[PDB]
Amino acid sequence: MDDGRKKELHDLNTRAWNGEEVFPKLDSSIKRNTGFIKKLKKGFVKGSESSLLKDLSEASLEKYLSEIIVTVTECLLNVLNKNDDVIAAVEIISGLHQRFNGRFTSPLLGAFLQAFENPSVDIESERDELQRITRVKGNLRVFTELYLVGVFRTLDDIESKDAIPNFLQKKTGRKDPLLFSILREILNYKFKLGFTTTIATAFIKKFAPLFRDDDNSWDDLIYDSKLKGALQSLFKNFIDATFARATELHKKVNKLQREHQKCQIRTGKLRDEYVEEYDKLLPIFIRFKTSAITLGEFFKLEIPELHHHHH
Ligand SMILES: [Cl-]
Incomplete structure (x- = not known):
């Protein structure tokens, strides 16, 4: 997915957040709707996007929404570290967001953010910690790709009804950009062991324009203009x-x-x-x-x- 397609989706996703119906009788049958869930459950991999997008343009999925949210939450958290699978997930989530807006995206975002809450216990096995870190990095990557297309933007989009993780609760006044909040949490679990330094390096390699002041390529994709400054501050402190x-x-x-x-x-x-x-x-x-x-x-x-x- 090139920057042009990111911007195309960003425009559509922003309009959907703004209450528009931007996604162009519907099939409300049990067979059709359960058939959609089964397709979701096979996972977000390359090519699976187009078939699911057809269903979104043919099926009335409203009464299966809650189940779709839970199903997609599980699928999203388990997306492989394959660039093509991530793109498929982005197109699929964008379609669902364009069909349903916040009643889909709000609870999805709130549940997805739980992936970034640090463990509240110590590291028992460094072998397990490496696996955990790998998972977090994948979740962070997917989150960020959905941020850049305007699906996952801010805690302000989440309904009070929809739960958010402990580490993001009780915010008042000026809120930090959401990526800043996520990174400040995950970089700081057992920092002295050095495993979180690889989250930092993986993130800058994949999302470099967020860290280079002269690189304006993603400016139209960024929710809060303070993001690049906040991230630069966070990472320079982390580097020290x-x-x-x-x-x-x-x-x-x-x-x-x-x-x-x-x-x-x-x-x-x-x-x-x-x-x-x-x-x-x-x-x-x-x-x-x-x-x-x-x-x-x-x-x-x-x-x-x-x-x-x-x-
Ligand atoms: Cl932001």
């Missing part, structure tokens, strides 16, 4: 933190390595207390260093000294 932690870890791993090496010269032993602690810290250091380098390259900044010769 990432650089600082990388430097702290760099000093620790080098110190432990040096003591281990001196020990091995003295005694000939392969193992000692220094390399045992080193082994626990090194993967964390590597996560921070890799991310420090990527963030530095993207924002054209020099990295702190992070030399380390390992293995």
Whole structure:
């Protein structure tokens, strides 16, 4: 999907939010409507969009709306990390939004945002944490693509009736852009372990125009003009933190390595207390260093000294 098609959908989706019927007797039969749900349940993958769009132009799905919302919520949260599948999901959600506006999109958005609430427990398995982070990144990607086409815009679109996650509740006065709110939450779960730094790098790589002031290509797609500024502030703070932690870890791993090496010269032993602690810290250091380098390259900044010769 090119920027032209994004803008086409944005215009249609904005009109739908504005109360227009922009989507052009309907079939209200049980067979037709359950047949639609079954099609949704096969998942949002490439090509599946066109068939579903035909149903939206032929079927009267109003009495199955609640079920469609739940079904789509599950499908959306489980979209694969495949660029073509994401595009299909965007076209399908846009169609549904154009047919039903807020009575579909409001509860969908509220339920979808639950995907960004941080766990309220500690990490038990870093293997599981990597899987969790992968899921969050996929959910963030899909959210952002739907933001850019004007489907998912702001908490202000959600009805009071429709629940929103705890981390987004009780907002008064000036609200931050929704993407800022989401990223401030997800970047800050167990930050010191370094797994969330990969959310930051994945996000800037895929959505670069949000981070480059000279890049105006998505300005017409952005809901609140403060977004680019807010995101730049958030990420520059995150970079300061990432650089600082990388430097702290760099000093620790080098110190432990040096003591281990001196020990091995003295005694000939392969193992000692220094390399045992080193082994626990090194993967964390590597996560921070890799991310420090990527963030530095993207924002054209020099990295702190992070030399380390390992293995
Ligand atoms: Cl915004």
